[PDB]
Structure formats: C-alpha cells, structure tokens
Design a binder for this molecule. Structure first.
Ligand SMILES: Nc1nc2c(ncn2[C@@H]2O[C@H](COP(=O)(O)OP(=O)(O)NP(=O)(O)O)[C@@H](O)[C@H]2O)c(=O)[nH]1
Ligand SMILES: [Mg+2]
Lengths: 166, 749
C-alpha cells in the first residue's frame, strides 16, 4: 500500500478542484468555490500495484502563496494545471515550475503539465506551445476536461508513474 | 444489597484501599466523612451539564498573549476541518464560536455534504468540532481564541486540525443511586506503658498538647530500661484546661531513647464533632526513618510495631491569577486555624478549572495538613473534580498515587477518592478501570523483567505477547494525558532502557483513526525512582511559563508528561524527534557538533534559523528556571533537544556551575571563547527578562517550593536575589552566565 503524495497546482480558476473532485467523486462541480487548501485521499490500483493517493488541492489566488513552500516541500508529485482558454494561467505555469525546482533543489521533480477545459471552444493556447514547454521541462503533457472526464484519470496516474520513475 | 457490594468491589479496586475496613481505626471520623461527603457529591452532580461535562471543553478567561495576537495575521485564523479521507482549510475569526464555525462550514456545503461524507439526513446540530487524534472537543459559547488547544497551536506554530464528528452521549455519564464533667479541669492523660515484638539505651515517653506544628503544653515520664514492654502507669496532667484545648488539638506521644526520637503517634483530643476524646487507647506508633509527623492515623502494621497505651478520663453520657495562588500560603503547616484555612479555600473557589489544574498537586498535598478528614479543602477538590473531567482525571491519579505509597494518609485520601468515584459517571469509572488494569499489568512485567537482572530482550517481547493476547485493553487513555488514547502495542519497538533502574520503553499505536499521523505513543514505564519529584519540578515549571506569559515571554519550556501511578512506579511521556545532547556528542567531539546536528535535521535554511531562535529561548528558559530551582548543574545525558531546536531537561532528582551552558550550546548562539554574538546577546537579554519576571513572584515561588519540601528552602531566596533591585539582580545573572562561559567542559567531563 504505497502512498503517493500528489499536489495539484496552477492559476486561479484553471480547474484544480474540478479535476480532483472529478477523479475523487467522479462528478463535475459547476459552482466555483475558491480553494485555500483541500485534501483528499483515494485507494487506487494503478498497474495492479494497489496504492494510496494523497491528492492536495492547492490555491491559485496569490493571496495564499506563502503556504506554497510548505506543500511544495512535502509534495511528491505536482500536477501543474492551466486552462486552454486562459493564456495567463499558462504563463503562470512557469512560476510554479521554478518555485518547485527551487523549493526542492532538484531538476527531476515528478511533474505533469496539464492543459484543462479542453471542452471549451474558444481556445487561446495552442497545443504546440504547451507540448514544447512540457518538452522543455522534460515532463508529460496531457490535455484534460473535468467536465467530459477527458484525460482526467490519465493525468493523475501519469503523475503516480512519474513519481515511480523518480 | 449484593449489587451495592459488587460495585463496592469495583471501587475498592480503583482506590487501591478498602474504606469499609475498620482494622486500623480508633473511632469513626472516616465513616462519618464517607457519609458527610455524599451531599457535596450529589450537589455537584445535580448541577453539572450533561453536555459540556461529557465534552469537558478546555478554555481560559485569561486574555490572549501579545506574542499570540501577533501570530494571527489579519483578523483570521486558518482551521482545517476533517471528516474522512477529506479535509478543508476554512477561514475563521478569533472571536468565532465553535458552533458559529460549524454553521459556516455547513452552509459552505449547501450542496457538497457528500464530499466531506456528511449524511444528508444527519442534522448539523448533531455535530461537534473535535481536535483530530485526541479527545479534546471545541464546544460551548466560547471564542475559538479561548480554547487552550488553539493557543497551543498558535503558540507552537502548528496547524489546527479538527475532525467533524458526533458528540459523546451524556447518557454514558450515568451515576448510580446509592458537655464535660467540668470544662475547667486541666486536661490529663495516663501513660500505661509501651510494648514491642522485637528490638534492634534507656527510653521515656513524651506527651504534648498540640495544635499543628505548635506545641502548647508538654509532659514526660520517668526514664526506664528499654525492655520489651516498659510500663509507667503514670498520670500526666497538663497545664491546659479542657475548655482551653483548641479545635483540632492533638495528643502527641513520642518515644525517646543527647536523647533520640524513635517512635511517635498522634491522637485527636477534640474529635470532629467537637467532643473531647475519652477512654482507653492502644495506639500503634510510627517509626522514625514534616506532615507525616502530624498524621492522626495509626500504624497499619499492628503485628510488628511499637504500641503505646494511654487512658483519658470519661464522663456521663445519657442516651487575579498568580495572585490567588498566594492564598495557598494559608493552607500549609503554618496555619492550622480551621477558620483561617476555610477563608483560604473560599478564596480559591474563584479560580478557573485551568488554574486549579496548575495547583491541583500542591492542593492535594495540602490536605495532609488538615486536622480532620472532612474539610473545605477536600470538598473543594472533590467538587472541582466532579465538575470537570480533566481535573477529575488528575485528581484520581494524584490520590490513587498517595494512597499507593503513604500509609500515613492512605485512609484519608481513600475516603476522598471514593467520594469522587461515586459521582464521576459510569463512563469515567470504566476508563479509570482500563487504565488501572494496564498500569497494573505493565507493572507486573516490569518486576517480572527487572527480576531477570540479551535474552531478557526477548523475555520482554514474550511477556508483552502474553498481555497482548486477550488480557490487555484494546486501548486505554494515557494517564499523563487524558486526551491521548493509546491502542495497540507495537512490541517491536518496545525495549528495556538500561540505567540504574530498568525502565521500560513501550510504544503504542494511537487508537484514534482521525489521528493525523502514523506515529506511535511513547511511554516510559519506570520502577524504582519516585516520580513524585519530577511531578513537582514540572508543576512549578508550568507555573513559570505562566509567570512569563503575563509578561509576553515565551521561553519555550517543554514540561513533558509524567504521572506517578503508584509507589516508586509511574510513567513519563516520550518526546518524539528528540535525543539527548550526550547521544549527539557520542555520534562524533568538536564544539560544533550540536550546531551541526541541528542544521542537519532542519530542512530549509529558514527552518534552521528557527531552531536556532527556539534554541536560544528554550535554553534561556531552562537556564533561568533551573538556576532559580537549584538544579542547573546537570549532565549532558539528562538534557534533551528536539530536532526543531527546543532544549529541555529531563529526569529530575535534585565542579560547581550555575547551570548548563557548555561550549556546544554557546557555539549554536554564534559565540566561542570570550567573544559575543547577536544571538548570544538576545540570549542574555531574554535570560535577564525572564529572571526578573520570576522575581516579581518570588513569594509565589517560595510558597510553592516550601509546600513541597514539607511533604533548606532558604537557597531559592538567594537564587531569586531577594532584597536586591532590578539593576542589581540583572548583573547577578549575567555574572552567572560568565561562570559557565569559563568552566567550559570542566563539570561535564
Ligand atoms: N468547461 C469546463 N469548465 C471547467 C473545467 N474545470 C473546471 N471548470 C469550471 O471552472 C470553474 C473553476 O473551477 P475550479 O475547479 O474551482 O478551479 P480552481 O483552479 O480549483 N480554483 P481556485 O484556484 O480558486 O482554487 C468552476 O465553475 C468549474 O465548473 C473543465 O475542464 N471544463
Ligand atoms: Mg479550487
């Protein structure tokens, strides 16, 4: 019963709680309830390894940026999420990438670039940019949608696997 | 009734003494008291709240420390609410009621009750905010800022996790149903003669009319060869008249053998019902190895003890916090006047459960100085214990402990303890009973393994299994900590620390599911040393942190847990992520060691600078404190430090040097030799500040210290520079530092 500590980070509104609550309760929340820091646990069987997932749902509002170091430390794997209809959040993804390298003084920290809200028509963030950036960081890139469950379980399990290959 | 007797058995089991005994009683005061306490009990039981009692909230009316108000950023305090594998961080105002905090969270879940896993049907009024991992609830009309646990978290800088769960059933706190011939005649006593089974000069008898440590009249008898049954059959008339005998007056009879005292016994001249004692008496005396020297109880050992014989004439019979603590001065040996004592107890009623908790030990001991068993002082303890489950807890062990090792007062404390048990609820009795089984269980093992003094290392595991298999409770409430439920026993981690005595290192898997961690509970069950000492040093230590708190000072003391469970037996809490200075030096040699270990344990650099700051304070806290208590000169082996840099002394049992401020310590403060340092300066400043704060209560400290010794204290008066002013005392301490600053490792090695 290995325990994988996963952390979901990203700008405000990108859908870190939807992606999580989706994978936890398999249901999509429509209301926006700004998070400070929620935690969720789920016993999952990845590749027959039957592990335990510790998903930490962080904040996006810079009003709580302080507590980032805390979790960025104890964090085993990070799910760097951004919306594909909101450019900013994409740019802000670099901000998280650096603070994580710093706080963990490593360059192999298990990370997964996640493009979300892919079910929305008005995209503004080409997948080529996201793929390249992810390629730059040397981590996987997975487009998702907490609404249509696209790439949801995949994103998380890919992280658990990143944490295993590290 | 039989059932009434089946329940008595149960009680005599927790008490550890039989109150229905008459073997060692020359009257009925005990019996009379057992019935006299029934009213106070029902009275307290009848008025307590089934809800809050069962929940026993830990709060305080004291204001919030400045060093704590600074802690809370904006007008809010983050709280994490847990349920299942889910938890959420909610914003809360220091002035928010627990119930208010719960209404909020519930409305925030207007449509998410499923996530947290809160039964849609399950009402919200049927929920309570319980600290995760422990039986500490946050309930009642009280600002979240006034709950001790919050202050504890803010202070230590820990996060506040509460688990949203169901309230205890008040129904579990059920309570079962159920004049002289002439008062002008000078008093007189007839000494028949002594007597004694075996035997190791000449010996005489000394009879004194006393009122406390105060001797009024005094008579003696003709010296005679200390045979096996010396007789006198002489009348010793005293100058005091029957009517002149003071309430609580004592007939002190001592056997002298430069003459030496060998035996002594006491007899109440004026019984509880204000009646002069009369008749023939055969009192089994006490033997020399103070309050024990005042006890009115006779020696339980009837078989082999010196017995003196007396005869008293008969007659015709038809058919405002650290302030209140100063009141404790009127409750020692110096004052015996019932009235004076009463006024004092009365004045103590104005204390809050939190303060009584701080003096509970001193107060308990103060009962020995009472002429009769039933007193305000005992009733105050009885009531304050029946009124609060946390006080009740410690009142139990304090009494059960005295009963387990002081025959001079076992009888009295027993009558009192039973008075409590008969009204603390059924639930409480059960918990008490489980604890007793364990401390009484591991007690056996300790003697079964200490008598085997490695293969013994296996003997421990074996024996633990015997208990481990249907015999040891599925879980119990840790004695030194009522809030901690130790469940399963992790025999693997259990061992036998090697020392003078043979302490037992036991680990217990927490029995709380909500427990925010897989850590185990560490308790050291030790036999041999009398934990009565430690308890007193810790009890004071805590009264110091409060003395400093009233001055915005946080010297970071770590008064670990310790409770005496019997005679020369008891347990001491184990502080995780903490080792002794000695062990650290043993893992290397250079004056930098200790400082290295720290940084080596501190993750981020910002974390290290913390432990350093904390080290600075804690080290000052213990230096000052240990110096004023006269216990500074110690060994690296008796000093521990937490991975977070919180120094703290342990094992209390007491060239020359004021306190422990070795090179390694000084090093961490950024100094070495004769130089200075910004941190070392900070250290000195704090020291002096803390030191003076204690002097502002020199009185309270002496009254608290002396009270102990009664069950030369002229040293603490010097340590506290009594008489000298601030600017003078300030220099006095600084100088003491320089002493350690020059002794280096002289006293250590
Ligand atoms: N169309 C679409 N909407 C989404 C998706 N994910 C989330 N949303 C919507 O976007 C809003 C914000 O989502 P939320 O999960 O709360 O974002 P967050 O990043 O966790 N917010 P915060 O940074 O404050 O913690 C919600 O109203 C939600 O329904 C998605 O994949 N597709
Ligand atoms: Mg959120």
């Amino acid at each position: 019963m290995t325990e994988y500590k996963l952390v979901v980070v990203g700008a405000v509104g990108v859908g870190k709680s939807a992606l999580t609550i989706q994978l936890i309760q398999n249901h999509f929340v429509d209301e926006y309830d700004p998070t400070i820091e929620d935690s969720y646990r789920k016993q999952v069987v990845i590749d027959g390894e039957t592990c335990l997932l510790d998903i930490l749902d962080t904040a996006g509002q810079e009003e709580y940026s302080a507590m980032r170091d805390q979790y960025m430390r104890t964090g085993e794997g990070f799910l760097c999420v951004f919306a594909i209809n909101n450019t900013k959040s994409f740019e802000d993804i670099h901000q998280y990438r650096e603070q994580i390298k710093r706080v963990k003084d490593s360059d192999d920290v298990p990370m997964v670039l996640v493009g979300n809200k892919c079910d929305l028509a008005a995209r503004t963030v080409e997948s080529r940019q996201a793929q390249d950036l992810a390629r730059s960081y040397g981590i996987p890139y997975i487009e998702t949608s907490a609404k249509t469950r696209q790439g949801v379980e995949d994103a998380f399990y890919t992280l658990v696997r990143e944490i295993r290959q590290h | 009734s039989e059932e009434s007797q089946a329940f008595q058995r149960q009680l005599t089991a927790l008490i550890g003494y039989d109150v229905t005994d008459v073997s060692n009683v020359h009257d009925d005061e005990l019996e009379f008291t057992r019935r006299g306490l029934v009213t106070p009990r029902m009275a307290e039981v009848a008025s307590r709240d089934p809800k809050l009692y069962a929940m026993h909230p830990w709060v305080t009316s004291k204001p919030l420390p400045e060093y704590l108000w600074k802690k809370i950023a904006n007008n809010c305090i983050f709280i994490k609410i847990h349920r299942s594998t889910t938890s959420q961080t909610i914003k809360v105002s220091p002035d928010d009621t627990p119930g208010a905090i719960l209404q909020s969270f519930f409305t925030k879940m207007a449509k998410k009750k499923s996530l947290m896993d809160i039964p849609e049907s399950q009402s919200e009024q049927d929920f309570v905010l319980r600290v995760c991992g422990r039986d500490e609830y946050l309930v009642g009309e009280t600002p979240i800022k006034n709950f001790q646990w919050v202050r504890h978290c803010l202070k230590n800088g820990e996060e506040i996790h509460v688990v949203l769960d169901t309230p205890p059933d008040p129904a579990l706190d059920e309570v079962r149903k159920e004049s002289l011939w002439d008062c002008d005649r000078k008093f007189r006593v007839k000494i028949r003669g002594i007597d004694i089974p075996v035997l190791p000069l000449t010996v005489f008898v000394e009879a004194n009319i006393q009122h406390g440590q105060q001797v009024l009249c005094q008579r003696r008898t003709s010296p005679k060869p200390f045979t096996e049954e010396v007789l006198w059959n002489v009348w010793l008339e005293f100058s005091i008249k029957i009517k002149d005998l003071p309430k609580g007056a004592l007939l002190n009879l001592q056997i002298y053998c430069k003459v030496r005292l060998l035996y002594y016994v006491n007899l109440l001249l004026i019984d509880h019902r204000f009646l002069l004692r009369r008749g023939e008496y055969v009192l089994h005396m006490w033997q020399i190895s103070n309050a024990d020297k005042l006890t009115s109880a006779t020696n339980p050992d009837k078989e082999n003890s010196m017995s003196i014989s007396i005869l008293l004439d008969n007659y015709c019979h038809p058919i405002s916090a650290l302030d209140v603590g100063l009141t404790m001065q009127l409750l020692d040996c110096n004052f015996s006047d019932e009235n004076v004592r009463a006024i004092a107890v009365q004045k103590l009623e104005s204390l809050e459960d939190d303060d009584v908790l701080h003096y509970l030990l001193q107060l308990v001991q103060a009962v020995k100085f009472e002429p009769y068993h039933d007193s305000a002082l005992a009733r105050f303890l009885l009531k304050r214990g029946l009124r609060n489950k946390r006080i009740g807890h410690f009142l139990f062990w304090f009494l059960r402990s005295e009963i387990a090792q002081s025959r001079h007062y076992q009888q009295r404390f027993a009558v009192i303890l039973e008075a409590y048990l008969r009204g603390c609820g059924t639930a409480m009795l059960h918990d008490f009973t489980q604890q007793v089984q364990v401390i009484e269980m591991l007690q056996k093992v300790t003697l079964d393994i200490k008598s085997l003094s490695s293969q013994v290392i296996s003997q421990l595991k074996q024996k633990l299994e015997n208990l481990q298999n249907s015999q040891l409770p599925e879980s119990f409430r840790v004695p030194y900590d009522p809030g901690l439920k130790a469940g399963a026993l992790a025999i693997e981690k259990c061992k036998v620390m090697a020392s003078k005595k043979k302490p037992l290192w036991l680990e217990f898997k927490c029995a709380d599911p909500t427990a925010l961690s897989n850590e185990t509970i560490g308790i050291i069950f030790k036999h041999g040393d009398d934990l009565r000492q430690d308890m007193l040093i810790l009890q004071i230590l805590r009264i110091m942190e409060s003395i400093w708190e009233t001055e915005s000072l946080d010297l970071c003391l770590l008064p670990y847990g310790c409770i005496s469970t019997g005679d020369k037996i008891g347990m001491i809490e184990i502080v995780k992520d903490a080792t002794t200075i000695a062990k650290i030096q043993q893992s290397t040699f250079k004056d930098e060691v200790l400082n290295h270990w720290l940084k080596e344990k501190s993750p981020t650099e910002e974390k290290f600078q913390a432990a350093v700051e904390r080290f600075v304070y804690s080290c000052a806290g213990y230096c000052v404190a240990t110096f004023v208590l006269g216990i500074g000169d110690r060994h690296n082996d008796n000093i521990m430090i937490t991975e977070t840099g919180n120094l703290f002394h342990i094992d209390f049992g007491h060239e020359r040097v004021p306190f422990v401020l070795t090179p390694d310590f000084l090093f961490v403060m950024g100094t070495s030799g004769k130089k200075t340092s910004p941190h070392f300066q900070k250290f000195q400043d704090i020291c002096v500040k803390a030191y003076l704060a204690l002097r502002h209560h020199t009185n309270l400290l002496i009254i608290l210290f002396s009270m102990m010794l009664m069950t030369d204290i002229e040293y603490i008066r010097d340590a506290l520079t009594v008489g000298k002013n601030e600017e003078d005392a300030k220099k006095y301490f600084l100088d003491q530092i320089e002493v350690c600053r020059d002794k280096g490792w002289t006293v250590q090695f």
